[PDB]
CSV table of C-alpha atoms and ligand atoms in Angstrom, one decimal:
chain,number,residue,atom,x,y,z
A,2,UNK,CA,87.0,63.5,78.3
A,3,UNK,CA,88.7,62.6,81.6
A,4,UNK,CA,90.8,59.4,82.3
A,5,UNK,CA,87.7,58.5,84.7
A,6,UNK,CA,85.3,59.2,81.8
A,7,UNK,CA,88.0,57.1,79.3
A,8,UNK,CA,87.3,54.5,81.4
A,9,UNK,CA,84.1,54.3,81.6
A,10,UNK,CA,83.7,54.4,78.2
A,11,UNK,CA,85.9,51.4,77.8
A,12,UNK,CA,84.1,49.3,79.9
A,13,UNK,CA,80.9,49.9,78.1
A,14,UNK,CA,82.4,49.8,74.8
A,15,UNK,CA,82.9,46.0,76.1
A,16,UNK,CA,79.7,45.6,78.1
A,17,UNK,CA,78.0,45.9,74.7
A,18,UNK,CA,75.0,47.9,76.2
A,19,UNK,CA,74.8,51.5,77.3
A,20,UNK,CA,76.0,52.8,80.4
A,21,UNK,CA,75.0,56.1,82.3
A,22,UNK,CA,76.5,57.2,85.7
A,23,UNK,CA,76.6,60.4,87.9
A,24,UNK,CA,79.1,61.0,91.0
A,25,UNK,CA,78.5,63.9,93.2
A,26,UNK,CA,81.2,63.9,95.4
A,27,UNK,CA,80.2,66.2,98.3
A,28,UNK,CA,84.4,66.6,99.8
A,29,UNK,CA,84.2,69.1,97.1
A,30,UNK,CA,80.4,69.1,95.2
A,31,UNK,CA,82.2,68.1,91.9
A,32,UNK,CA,80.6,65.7,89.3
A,33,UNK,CA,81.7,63.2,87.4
A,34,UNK,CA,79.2,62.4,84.5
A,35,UNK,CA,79.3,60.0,81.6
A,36,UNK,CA,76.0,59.8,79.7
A,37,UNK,CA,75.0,61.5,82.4
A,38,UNK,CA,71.8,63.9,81.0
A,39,UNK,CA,70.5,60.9,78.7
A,40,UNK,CA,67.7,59.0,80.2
A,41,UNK,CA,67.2,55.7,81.4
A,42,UNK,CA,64.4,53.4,82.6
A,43,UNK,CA,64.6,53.9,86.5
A,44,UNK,CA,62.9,50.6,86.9
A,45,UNK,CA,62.9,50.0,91.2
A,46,UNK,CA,65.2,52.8,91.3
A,47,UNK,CA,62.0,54.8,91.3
A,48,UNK,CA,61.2,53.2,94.7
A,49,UNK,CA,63.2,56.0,96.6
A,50,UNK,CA,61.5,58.9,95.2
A,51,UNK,CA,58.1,57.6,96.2
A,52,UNK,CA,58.7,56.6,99.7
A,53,UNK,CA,61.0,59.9,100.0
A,54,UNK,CA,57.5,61.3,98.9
A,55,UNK,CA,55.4,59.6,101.7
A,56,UNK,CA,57.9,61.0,104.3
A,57,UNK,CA,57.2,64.2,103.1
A,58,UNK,CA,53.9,63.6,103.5
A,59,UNK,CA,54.9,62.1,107.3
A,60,UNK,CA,55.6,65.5,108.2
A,61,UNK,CA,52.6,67.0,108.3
A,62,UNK,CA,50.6,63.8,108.8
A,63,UNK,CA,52.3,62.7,112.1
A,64,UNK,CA,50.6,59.6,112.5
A,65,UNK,CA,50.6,58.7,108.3
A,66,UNK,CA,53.4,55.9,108.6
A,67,UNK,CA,51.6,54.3,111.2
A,68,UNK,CA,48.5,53.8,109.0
A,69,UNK,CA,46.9,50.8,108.3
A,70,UNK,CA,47.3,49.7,104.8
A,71,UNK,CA,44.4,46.8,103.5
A,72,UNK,CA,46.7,44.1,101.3
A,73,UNK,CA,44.4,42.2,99.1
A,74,UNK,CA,44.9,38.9,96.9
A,75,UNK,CA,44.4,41.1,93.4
A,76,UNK,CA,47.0,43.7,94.7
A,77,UNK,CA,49.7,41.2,94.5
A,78,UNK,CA,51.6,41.5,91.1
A,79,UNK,CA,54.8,39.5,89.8
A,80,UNK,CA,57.1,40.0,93.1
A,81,UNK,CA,56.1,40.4,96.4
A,82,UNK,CA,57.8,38.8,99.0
A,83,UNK,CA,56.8,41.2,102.1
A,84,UNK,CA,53.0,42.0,101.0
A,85,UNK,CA,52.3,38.0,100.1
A,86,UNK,CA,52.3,37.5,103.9
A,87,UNK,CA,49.7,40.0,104.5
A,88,UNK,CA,47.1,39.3,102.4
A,89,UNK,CA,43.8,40.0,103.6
A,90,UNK,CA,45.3,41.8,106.1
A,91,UNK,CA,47.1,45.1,106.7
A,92,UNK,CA,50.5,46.9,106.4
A,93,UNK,CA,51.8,50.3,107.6
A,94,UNK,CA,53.2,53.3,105.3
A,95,UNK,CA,56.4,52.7,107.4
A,96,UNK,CA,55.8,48.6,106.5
A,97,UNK,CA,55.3,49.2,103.0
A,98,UNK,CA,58.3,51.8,102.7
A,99,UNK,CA,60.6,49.5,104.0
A,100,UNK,CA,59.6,46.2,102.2
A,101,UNK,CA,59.5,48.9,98.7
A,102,UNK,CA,63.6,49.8,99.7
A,103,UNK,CA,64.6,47.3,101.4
A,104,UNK,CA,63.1,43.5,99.4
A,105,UNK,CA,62.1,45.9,96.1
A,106,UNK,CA,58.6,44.6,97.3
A,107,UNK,CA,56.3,45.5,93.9
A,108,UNK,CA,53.3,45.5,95.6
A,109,UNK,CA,54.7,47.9,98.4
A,110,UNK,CA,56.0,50.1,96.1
A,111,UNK,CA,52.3,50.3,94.5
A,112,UNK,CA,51.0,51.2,98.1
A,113,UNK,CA,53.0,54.0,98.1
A,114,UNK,CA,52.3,55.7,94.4
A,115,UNK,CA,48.3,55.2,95.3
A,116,UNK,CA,48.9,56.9,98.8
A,117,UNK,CA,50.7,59.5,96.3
A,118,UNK,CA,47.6,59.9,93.8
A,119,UNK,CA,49.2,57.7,91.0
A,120,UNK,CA,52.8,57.9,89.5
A,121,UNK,CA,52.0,61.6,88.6
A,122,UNK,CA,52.2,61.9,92.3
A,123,UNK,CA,55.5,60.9,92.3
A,124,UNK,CA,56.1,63.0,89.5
A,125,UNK,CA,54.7,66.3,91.2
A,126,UNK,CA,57.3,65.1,94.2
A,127,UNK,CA,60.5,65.5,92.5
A,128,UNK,CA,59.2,68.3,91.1
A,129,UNK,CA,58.7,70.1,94.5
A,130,UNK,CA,62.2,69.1,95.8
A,131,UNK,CA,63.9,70.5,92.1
A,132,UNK,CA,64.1,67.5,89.8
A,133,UNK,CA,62.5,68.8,86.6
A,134,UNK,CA,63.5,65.1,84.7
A,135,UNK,CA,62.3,62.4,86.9
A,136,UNK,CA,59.3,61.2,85.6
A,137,UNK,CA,56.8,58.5,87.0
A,138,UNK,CA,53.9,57.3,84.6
A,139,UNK,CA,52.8,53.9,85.8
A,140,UNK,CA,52.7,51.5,88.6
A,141,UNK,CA,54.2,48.3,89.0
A,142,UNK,CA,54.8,46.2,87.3
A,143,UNK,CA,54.8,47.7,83.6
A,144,UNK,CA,57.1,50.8,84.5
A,145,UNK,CA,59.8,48.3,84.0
A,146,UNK,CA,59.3,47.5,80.4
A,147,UNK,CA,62.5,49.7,79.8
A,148,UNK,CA,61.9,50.0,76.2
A,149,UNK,CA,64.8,51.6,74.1
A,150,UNK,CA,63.5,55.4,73.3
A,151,UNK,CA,60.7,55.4,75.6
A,152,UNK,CA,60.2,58.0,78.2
A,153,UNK,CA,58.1,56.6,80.2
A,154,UNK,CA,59.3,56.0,83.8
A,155,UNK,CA,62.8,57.4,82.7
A,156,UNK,CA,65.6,60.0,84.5
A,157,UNK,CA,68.7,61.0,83.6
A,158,UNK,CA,71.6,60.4,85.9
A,159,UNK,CA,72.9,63.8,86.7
A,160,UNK,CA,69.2,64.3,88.0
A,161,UNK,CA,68.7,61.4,90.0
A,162,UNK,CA,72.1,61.8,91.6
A,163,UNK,CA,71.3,65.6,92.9
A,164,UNK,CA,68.0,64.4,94.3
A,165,UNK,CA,69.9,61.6,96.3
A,166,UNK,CA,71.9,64.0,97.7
A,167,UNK,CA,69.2,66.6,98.0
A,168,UNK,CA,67.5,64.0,99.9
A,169,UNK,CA,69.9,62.0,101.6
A,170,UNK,CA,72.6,64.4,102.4
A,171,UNK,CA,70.8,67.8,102.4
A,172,UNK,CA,67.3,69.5,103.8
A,173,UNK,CA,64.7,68.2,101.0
A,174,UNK,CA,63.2,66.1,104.0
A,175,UNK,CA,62.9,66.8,108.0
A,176,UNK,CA,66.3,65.6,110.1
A,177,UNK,CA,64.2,62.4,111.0
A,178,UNK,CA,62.9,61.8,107.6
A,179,UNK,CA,66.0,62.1,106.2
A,180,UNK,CA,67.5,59.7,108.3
A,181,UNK,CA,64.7,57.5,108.4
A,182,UNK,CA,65.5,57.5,104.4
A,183,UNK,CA,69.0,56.9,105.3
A,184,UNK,CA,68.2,53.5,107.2
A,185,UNK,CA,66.4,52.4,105.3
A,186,UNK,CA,69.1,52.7,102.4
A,187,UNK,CA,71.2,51.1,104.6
A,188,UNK,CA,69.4,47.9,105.2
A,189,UNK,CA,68.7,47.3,101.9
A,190,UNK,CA,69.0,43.4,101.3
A,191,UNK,CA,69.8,43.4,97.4
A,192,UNK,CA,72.7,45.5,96.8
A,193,UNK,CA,75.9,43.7,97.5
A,194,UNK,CA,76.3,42.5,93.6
A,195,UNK,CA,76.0,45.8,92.3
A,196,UNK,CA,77.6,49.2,93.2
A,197,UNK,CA,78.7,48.1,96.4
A,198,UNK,CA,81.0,45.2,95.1
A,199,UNK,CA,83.4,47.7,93.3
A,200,UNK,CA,83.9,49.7,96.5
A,201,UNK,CA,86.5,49.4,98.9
A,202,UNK,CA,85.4,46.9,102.2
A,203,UNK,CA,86.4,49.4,104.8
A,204,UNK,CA,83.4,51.8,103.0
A,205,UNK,CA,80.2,51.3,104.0
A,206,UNK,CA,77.1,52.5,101.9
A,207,UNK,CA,73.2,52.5,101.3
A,208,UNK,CA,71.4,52.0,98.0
A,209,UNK,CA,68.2,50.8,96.2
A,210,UNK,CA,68.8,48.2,92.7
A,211,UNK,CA,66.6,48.4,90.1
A,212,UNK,CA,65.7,45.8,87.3
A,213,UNK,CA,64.2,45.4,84.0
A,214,UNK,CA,63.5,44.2,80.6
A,215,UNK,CA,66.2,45.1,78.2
A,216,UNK,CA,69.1,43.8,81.1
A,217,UNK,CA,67.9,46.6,82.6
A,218,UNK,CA,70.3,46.8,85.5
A,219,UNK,CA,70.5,50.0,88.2
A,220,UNK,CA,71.7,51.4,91.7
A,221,UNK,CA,71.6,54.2,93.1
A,222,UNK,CA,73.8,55.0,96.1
A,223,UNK,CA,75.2,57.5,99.0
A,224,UNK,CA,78.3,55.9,100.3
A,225,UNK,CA,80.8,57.0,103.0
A,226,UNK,CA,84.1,56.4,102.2
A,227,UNK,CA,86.5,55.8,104.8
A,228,UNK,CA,88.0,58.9,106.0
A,229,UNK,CA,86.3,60.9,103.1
A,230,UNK,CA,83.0,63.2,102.7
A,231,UNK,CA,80.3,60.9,101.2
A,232,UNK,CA,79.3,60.7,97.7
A,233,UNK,CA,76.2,59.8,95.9
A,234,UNK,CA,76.5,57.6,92.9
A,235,UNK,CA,74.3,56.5,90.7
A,236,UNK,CA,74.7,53.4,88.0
A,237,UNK,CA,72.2,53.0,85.1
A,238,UNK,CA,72.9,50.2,82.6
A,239,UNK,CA,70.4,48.8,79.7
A,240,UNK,CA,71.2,46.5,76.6
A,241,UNK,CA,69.7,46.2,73.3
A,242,UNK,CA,67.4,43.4,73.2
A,243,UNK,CA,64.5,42.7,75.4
A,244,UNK,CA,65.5,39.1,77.1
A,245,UNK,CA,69.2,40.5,77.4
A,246,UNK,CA,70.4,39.1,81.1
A,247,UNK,CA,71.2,41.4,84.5
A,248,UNK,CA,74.9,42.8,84.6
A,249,UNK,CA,75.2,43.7,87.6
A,250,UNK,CA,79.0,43.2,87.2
A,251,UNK,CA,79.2,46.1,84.6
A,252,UNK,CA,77.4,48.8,88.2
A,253,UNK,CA,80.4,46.9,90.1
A,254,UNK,CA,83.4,47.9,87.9
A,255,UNK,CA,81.6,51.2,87.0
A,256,UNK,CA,81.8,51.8,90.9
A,257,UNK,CA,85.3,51.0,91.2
A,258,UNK,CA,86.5,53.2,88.3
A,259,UNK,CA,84.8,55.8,90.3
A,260,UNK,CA,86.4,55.1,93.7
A,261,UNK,CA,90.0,54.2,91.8
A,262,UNK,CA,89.6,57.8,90.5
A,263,UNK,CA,88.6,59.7,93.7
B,1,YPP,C1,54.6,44.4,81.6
B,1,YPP,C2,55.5,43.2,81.5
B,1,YPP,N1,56.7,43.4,82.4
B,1,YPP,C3,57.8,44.3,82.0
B,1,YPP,C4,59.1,43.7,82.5
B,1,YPP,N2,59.0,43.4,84.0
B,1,YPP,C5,60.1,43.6,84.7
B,1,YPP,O1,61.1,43.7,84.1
B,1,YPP,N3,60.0,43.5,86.0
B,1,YPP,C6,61.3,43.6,86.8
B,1,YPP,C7,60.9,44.1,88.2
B,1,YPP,O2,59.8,43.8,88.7
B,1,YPP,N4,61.9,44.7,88.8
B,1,YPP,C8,61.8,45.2,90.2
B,1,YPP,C9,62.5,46.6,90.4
B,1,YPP,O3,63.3,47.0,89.6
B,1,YPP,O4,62.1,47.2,91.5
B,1,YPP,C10,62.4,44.2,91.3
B,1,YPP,N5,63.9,43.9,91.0
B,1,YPP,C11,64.0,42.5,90.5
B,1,YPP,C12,65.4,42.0,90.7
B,1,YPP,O5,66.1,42.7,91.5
B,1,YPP,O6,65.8,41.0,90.1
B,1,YPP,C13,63.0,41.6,91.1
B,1,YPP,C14,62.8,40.4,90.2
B,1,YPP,C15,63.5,41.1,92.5
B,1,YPP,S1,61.6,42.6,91.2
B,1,YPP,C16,62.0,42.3,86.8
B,1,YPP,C17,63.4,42.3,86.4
B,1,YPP,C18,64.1,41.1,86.4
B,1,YPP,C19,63.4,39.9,86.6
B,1,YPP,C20,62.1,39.9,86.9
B,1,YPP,C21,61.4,41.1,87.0
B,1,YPP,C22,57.7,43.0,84.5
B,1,YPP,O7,57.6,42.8,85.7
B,1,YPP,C23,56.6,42.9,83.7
B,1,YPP,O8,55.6,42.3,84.1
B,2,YPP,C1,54.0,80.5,98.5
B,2,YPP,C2,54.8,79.6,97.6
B,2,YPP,N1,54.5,78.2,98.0
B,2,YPP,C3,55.0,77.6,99.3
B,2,YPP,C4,54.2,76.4,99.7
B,2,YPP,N2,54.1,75.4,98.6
B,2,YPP,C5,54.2,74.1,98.9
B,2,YPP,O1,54.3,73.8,100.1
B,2,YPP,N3,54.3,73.2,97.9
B,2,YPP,C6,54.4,71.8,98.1
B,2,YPP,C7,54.2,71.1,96.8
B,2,YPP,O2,54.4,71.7,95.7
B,2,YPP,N4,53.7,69.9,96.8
B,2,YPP,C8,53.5,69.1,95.6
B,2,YPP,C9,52.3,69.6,94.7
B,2,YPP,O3,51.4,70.2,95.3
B,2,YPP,O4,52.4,69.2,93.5
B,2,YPP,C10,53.5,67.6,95.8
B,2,YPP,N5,52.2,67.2,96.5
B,2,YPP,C11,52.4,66.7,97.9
B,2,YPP,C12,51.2,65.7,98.3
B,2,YPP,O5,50.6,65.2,97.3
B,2,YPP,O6,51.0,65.6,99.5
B,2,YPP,C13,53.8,66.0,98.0
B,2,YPP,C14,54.3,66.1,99.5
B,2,YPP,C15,53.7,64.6,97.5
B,2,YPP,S1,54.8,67.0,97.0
B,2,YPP,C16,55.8,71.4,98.5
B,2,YPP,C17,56.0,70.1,99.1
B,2,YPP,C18,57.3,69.7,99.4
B,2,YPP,C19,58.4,70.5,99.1
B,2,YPP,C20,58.2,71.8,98.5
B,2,YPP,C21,56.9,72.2,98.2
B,2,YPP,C22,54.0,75.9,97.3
B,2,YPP,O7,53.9,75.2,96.3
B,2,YPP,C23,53.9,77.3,97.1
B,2,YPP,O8,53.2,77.8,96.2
C-alpha cells in the first residue's frame, strides 16, 4: 500500500461509497491502481469505446462519418440535447460522435452501438484493440442502472485506463482517428467538476463523464501536465443506494491525490 494508495483509501473511507481509479503515467508507463481490477458500471464512460469503434470503422469506410443518420421522434430517450434538434431529419457519424463525447447525447450514443451491431459490437471492439474486460450489453438508457454486483455494462479500471492510452496515446486507431478522438476529448463540455477540477490550471486535459443510478459518478481522462509526459486517468465512483446523489467532488480530490503524488 503506497502513501498515494493510503490516500485514496482515506478519502473513500469518508466518501462513504466505493471508489476505483487507474493512472498510467506514460513519463515512465507506471500504474497506480486502487480497486483498480474490480468492476464498475461504465455508465457514459462507455461513450468513448463506441465512437473509438466507428472510427475504426472510418478507416476503411472513408466516407462513413460523413453518413447520413435518420433521427426519429421514438429514438429520443431520457437526454438528448443534440439529437432533439434533428428530429425527423438527419445527423452524420461525425455528428453523432461528437454530440455522444462531447453533450453525453443518449440518443447519439445509441446511433453509434446500432451502426456497431448492438452493444456486443462494442464489446467485440475492445476486444480487437486488447481489452478482454470491457463489456457492453445494452443501449441507452438502461446500461446505466449501475446496480451493485451486476456485470452488465461494467469494466475494471486498470482495463479502461490501458485502452485510453492504447487509443489516445498509442496506434489502436489511424494518426487522424486518433486525433480526431483526441478533439473530441478535448471539447468535451461536461468535465470541469470532475477529474479536471483536482488538476493543476496550467494542465490542460480531455475526458468523457459518466453518470448513473447508485451516485454513479465517472471520468475518464488523458491529461498533459505541464512540462511532463501525459497520463491517462481514470475515476469510477458508485454508492450504496439507488437515489444516492452525484459526487463529482470525490473524481476531483481523487485527481489531485494523483497529481500531488506524481
Ligand atoms: C432504466 C432506468 N434508468 C436507469 C438510470 N438512468 C440513468 O442513470 N441515466 C443516467 C444517464 O443517462 N447518464 C448519461 C451518461 O452517463 O452518459 C448522461 N450523463 C448525465 C449527467 O452527466 O448528469 C446526464 C443526465 C447528462 S445523461 C443519468 C444520471 C443522472 C441523472 C440522470 C440520468 C436512466 O436513464 C434510466 O432510464
Ligand atoms: C490473420 C489474423 N487476422 C488479421 C485481421 N483481423 C482483423 O482485422 N480483425 C478485426 C476484428 O477483429 N474486428 C472485430 C470483430 O470482427 O469482432 C470488430 N468488428 C469490426 C466491425 O464490426 O466493423 C470493428 C471495427 C467494430 S472491431 C480487427 C479490427 C480492429 C483491430 C484489430 C482487428 C483478424 O481478426 C484476423 O483474424
Amino acid at each position: 500500500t503506497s502513501a498515494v494508495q493510503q490516500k485514496l483509501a482515506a478519502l473513500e473511507k469518508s466518501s462513504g461509497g466505493r471508489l476505483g481509479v487507474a493512472l498510467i503515467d506514460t513519463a515512465d508507463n507506471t500504474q497506480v491502481l486502487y480497486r483498480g481490477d474490480e468492476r464498475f458500471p461504465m455508465c457514459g464512460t462507455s461513450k468513448v469505446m463506441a465512437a473509438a469503434a466507428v472510427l475504426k470503422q472510418s478507416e476503411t469506410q472513408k466516407q462513413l462519418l460523413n453518413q447520413p443518420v435518420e433521427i426519429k421522434p421514438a429514438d429520443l430517450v431520457n437526454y438528448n440535447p443534440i439529437a432533439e434538434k434533428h428530429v425527423n431529419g438527419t445527423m452524420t457519424l461525425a455528428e453523432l460522435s461528437a454530440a455522444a463525447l462531447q453533450y453525453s447525447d443518449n440518443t447519439a450514443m445509441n446511433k453509434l452501438i446500432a451502426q456497431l451491431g448492438g452493444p456486443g459490437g462494442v464489446t467485440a471492439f475492445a476486444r480487437a484493440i486488447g481489452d478482454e474486460t470491457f463489456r457492453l450489453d445494452r443501449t441507452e438508457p438502461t446500461l446505466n442502472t449501475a446496480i451493485p454486483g451486476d456485470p452488465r455494462d461494467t469494466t475494471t479500471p486498470r482495463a479502461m485506463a490501458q485502452t485510453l492510452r492504447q487509443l489516445t496515446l498509442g496506434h489502436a486507431l489511424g494518426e487522424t482517428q486518433r486525433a480526431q478522438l483526441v478533439t473530441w476529448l478535448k471539447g468535451n463540455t461536461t468535465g470541469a467538476a470532475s477529474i479536471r477540477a483536482g488538476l493543476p490550471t496550467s494542465w490542460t486535459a480531455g475526458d468523457k463523464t459518466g453518470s448513473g443510478d447508485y451516485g454513479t459518478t465517472n471520468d475518464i481522462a488523458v491529461i498533459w501536465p505541464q512540462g511532463r509526459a501525459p497520463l491517462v486517468l481514470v475515476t469510477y465512483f458508485t454508492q450504496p443506494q439507488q437515489n444516492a446523489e452525484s459526487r463529482r467532488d470525490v473524481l476531483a480530490s481523487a485527481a489531485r491525490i494523483i497529481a500531488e503524488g506524481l
